Scaffold this motif. Structure first.
Motif, PDB file in Angstrom:
ATOM      1  N   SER A 237       0.904  -1.170  -0.010  1.00  0.00           N
ATOM      2  CA  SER A 237      -0.015  -0.109  -0.093  1.00  0.00           C
ATOM      3  C   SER A 237       0.932   1.214   0.040  1.00  0.00           C
ATOM      4  O   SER A 237       1.666   1.321   0.841  1.00  0.00           O
ATOM      5  CB  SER A 237      -0.851   0.001   0.982  1.00  0.00           C
ATOM      6  OG  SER A 237      -1.603   1.302   1.104  1.00  0.00           O
TER       7      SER A 237
ATOM      8  N   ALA B 279      -6.012   2.918   1.799  1.00  0.00           N
ATOM      9  CA  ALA B 279      -5.624   2.137   2.826  1.00  0.00           C
ATOM     10  C   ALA B 279      -6.691   1.115   2.916  1.00  0.00           C
ATOM     11  O   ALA B 279      -6.387  -0.275   3.081  1.00  0.00           O
ATOM     12  CB  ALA B 279      -5.442   2.904   4.269  1.00  0.00           C
TER      13      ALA B 279
ATOM     14  N   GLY C 120      -0.733   4.038   0.737  1.00  0.00           N
ATOM     15  CA  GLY C 120      -1.143   4.801   1.828  1.00  0.00           C
ATOM     16  C   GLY C 120      -1.989   5.928   1.332  1.00  0.00           C
ATOM     17  O   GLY C 120      -3.054   6.335   2.139  1.00  0.00           O
ATOM     18  N   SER C 121      -2.217   6.380  -0.051  1.00  0.00           N
ATOM     19  CA  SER C 121      -2.730   7.343  -0.472  1.00  0.00           C
ATOM     20  C   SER C 121      -2.912   7.123  -2.042  1.00  0.00           C
ATOM     21  O   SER C 121      -2.001   6.504  -2.604  1.00  0.00           O
ATOM     22  CB  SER C 121      -2.130   8.719   0.008  1.00  0.00           C
ATOM     23  OG  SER C 121      -0.996   9.007  -0.713  1.00  0.00           O
TER      24      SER C 121
END
Ligand SMILES: *[C@@H]1O[C@H](CO)[C@@H](O[C@@H]2O[C@H](CO)[C@@H](O)[C@H](O)[C@H]2NC(C)=O)[C@H](O)[C@H]1NC(C)=O
Ligand SMILES: *[C@@H]1O[C@H](CO)[C@@H](O[C@@H]2O[C@H](CO)[C@@H](O)[C@H](O)[C@H]2NC(C)=O)[C@H](O)[C@H]1NC(C)=O
Ligand SMILES: *[C@@H]1O[C@H](CO)[C@@H](O)[C@H](O)[C@H]1NC(C)=O
Ligand SMILES: *[C@@H]1O[C@H](CO)[C@@H](O)[C@H](O)[C@H]1NC(C)=O
Ligand SMILES: *[C@@H]1O[C@H](CO)[C@@H](O)[C@H](O)[C@H]1NC(C)=O
Ligand code: NA
Ligand SMILES: [Xe]
Lengths: 180, 344
Positions: free
Chosen positions: B149, B172, B151-152
């Motif tokens: 990931s 996420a 994260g964004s």
């Protein structure tokens, strides 16, 4: 099964004119292959020419699209909206409210464009509405590129664009599509 | 409409699929590829827009998708399922001045956006409170095959009702659960509550619940079986309502209901059935297509697309052998038995 058309600007007369086939000098061109019988889809490929300003490109994009898909437009209109707010409509109250709402909304956009000639946002809105104007003008067989304000008919080809918006405009205007 | 964004095992790929539900009379379809040269602003000095190249599923005379499903040359794929609004107190926010109709906001956002955040920023201006949808914006520029990931940035979710638009980056959550499904019910609790859905859950039960409705349960049960494009198509076309326990409507007679599937076939419900609300009736309406793309396909402005109501486990729809043979369907095939094709 396939059709290609280009929209040229005759610099001599300043007149826009449709020609058959591919002319990469044109303001725009499009081609449509109708494979509906074989695959359930038709396919449209459309390009505009960066040598012209984007307002003219947008109008031309509408024009050439309508030019290669006129038959399909007619049939889709007949299948989907030919009765919507027609001359014999019983819900005259709702249809009048809808027409008034759409005319006021279109006017409001035209005013914002006039009041904000340097806005990128309103430039993009104007391009969208020019494409709609070119689609309808080309379908009706008479081209007129606007350099300033222009009037979109509330119940013309706008109706093909607002099917989703109408799901909410109907209850919002107290009337008595896509989704579940 | 049903939609599914699926991270394949090991993060090997990220598939995005959408199945439009619409009236059967709307099944004249055009897949459109535009290559434009528009600029961001009204002067030649402005840069070319990010979204000049786009491929999308559409209809004759319709200068946007309507489905909606777009693959943009900016590296974004944008798609939605419709949430509507059931709270009449919000209709006062639908006004002719200060509101741009949704189809325009969609086209403008697709043209200007470089990423999910900017798409949302553009789209939400002058919110009309009409064509109220849950939009998913997938940014393949933020997707690294096999990567963890980031994260964004990969997935942005936007929900619109009159007077309110809520936006969140859900990257996420996508990486945690490995999918994002959409099925005409808002995910954001504030939107679910403001739009009147609690009253409907109270009256009619789980069909209106975000987590417990039939499509939500079918995706929960089956989404992990999507291991490739073909598996995606199979799920997005899924309707086995006569045999699937998740398709039972306990308040209906008969109980199995063909609306309760990933790809609805409302034409197959009996006309003399007993149903608690209109969505469950016999109707000439249901899933009418599927489009699927992937990291590589989107890079080449390509998709797999199948036109017409599902016939994987249901009998193929045929106008002349349906209750709806008298409806106008000019230009359409009589029998709908098409398989997916690669487009272009
Ligand atoms: C974009 O280019 C077009 C085509 O050259 C311009 O349209 C001309 O505009 C002038 C008025 O300014 C008219 O006298 C001509 O008749 C127009 N041509 C056509 C074909 O209609 C246009 O001004 C340019 N700018 C914009 C914003 O459209
Ligand atoms: C959305 O509305 C629901 C339903 O009214 C709210 O849930 C209730 O919340 C209260 C206060 O916490 C509880 O006492 C009730 O039992 C809940 N009822 C349920 C779960 O059906 C919920 O809090 C609201 N959510 C938001 C974000 O506004
Ligand atoms: C349009 O013409 C081009 C010319 O190469 C062709 O490659 C393409 O397949 C055509 N597209 C359609 C929609 O028919
Ligand atoms: C619709 O009806 C309500 C009455 O419940 C009224 O308040 C509202 O102004 C009406 N809206 C329109 C646009 O007619
Ligand atoms: C409902 O209609 C079906 C289809 O013709 C028929 O077979 C069945 O007998 C009917 N059931 C009832 C309760 O009428
Ligand atoms: Na939709
Ligand atoms: Xe609007």
């Amino acid at each position: 099964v396939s059709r290609t058309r280009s929209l040229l600007l005759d610099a001599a007369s300043g007149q826009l004119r449709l020609e058959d086939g591919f002319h990469p000098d044109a303001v725009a061109w499009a081609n449509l292959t109708n494979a509906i019988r074989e695959t359930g889809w038709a396919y449209l490929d459309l390009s505009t020419n960066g040598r012209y300003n984007d307002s003219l490109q947008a109008y031309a994009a509408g024009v050439v699209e309508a030019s290669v898909s006129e038959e399909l437009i007619y049939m889709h209109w007949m299948n989907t909206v030919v009765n919507y707010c027609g001359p014999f409509e019983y819900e005259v109250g709702y249809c009048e409210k809808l027409k008034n709402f759409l005319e006021a909304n279109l006017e409001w956009m035209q005013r914002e464009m006039e009041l904000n000639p340097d806005s990128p946002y309103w430039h993009q809105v104007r391009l969208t509405l020019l494409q709609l104007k070119g689609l309808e003008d080309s379908y009706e067989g008479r081209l007129t590129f606007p350099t300033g304000r222009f009037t979109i008919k509330p119940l013309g080809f706008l109706l093909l664009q607002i099917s989703g918006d109408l799901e909410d405009l109907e209850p919002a205007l107290n009337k008595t599509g896509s989704g579940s | 409409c049903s939609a599914l964004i699926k991270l394949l095992p090991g993060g090997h790929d990220l598939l995005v699929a959408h199945n439009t539900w619409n009236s059967y009379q709307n099944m004249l379809r055009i897949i459109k590829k535009y290559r434009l040269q528009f600029r961001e602003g009204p002067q030649e000095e402005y840069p070319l827009v990010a979204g000049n190249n786009l491929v999308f599923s559409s209809y004759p005379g319709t200068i946007f998708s309507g489905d909606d499903f777009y693959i943009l040359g900016s590296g974004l794929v944008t798609l939605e399922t419709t949430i509507g609004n059931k709270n009449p107190a919000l209709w006062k926010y639908v006004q002719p001045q200060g509101c741009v109709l949704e189809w325009i906001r969609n086209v403008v956002a697709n043209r200007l956006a470089l990423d999910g955040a900017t798409w949302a920023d553009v789209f939400k201006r002058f919110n009309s409170g009409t064509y109220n949808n849950q939009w998913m914006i997938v940014d393949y520029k933020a997707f690294l095959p096999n990567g963890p990931s980031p994260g964004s940035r990969v997935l942005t979710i936007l929900e619109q009702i009159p007077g309110m638009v809520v936006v969140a980056d859900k990257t996420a959550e996508l990486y945690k659960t490995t999918y994002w499904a959409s099925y005409n019910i808002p995910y954001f609790e504030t939107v679910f509550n403001a739009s009147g859905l609690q009253a409907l859950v109270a009256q009619y039960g789980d069909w209106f619940s975000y987590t417990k409705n039939p499509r939500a349960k079918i995706f929960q049960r089956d989404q992990s079986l999507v291991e490739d494009m073909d598996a995606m198509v199979r799920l997005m076309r899924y309707n086995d309502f006569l045999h699937d326990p998740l398709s039972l409507c306990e308040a209906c007679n008969p109980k199995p209901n063909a609306e309760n599937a990933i790809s609805a076939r409302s034409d197959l419900n009996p006309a003399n059935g007993s149903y608690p609300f209109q969505a469950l009736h016999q109707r000439a309406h249901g899933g009418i297509d599927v489009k699927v793309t992937s990291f590589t396909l989107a890079k080449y402005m390509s998709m797999l697309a199948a036109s017409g109501p599902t016939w994987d486990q249901c009998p193929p729809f045929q106008w002349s052998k349906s209750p709806f043979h008298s409806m106008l369907h000019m230009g359409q095939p009589d029998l709908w038995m098409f398989s997916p094709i690669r487009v272009p």
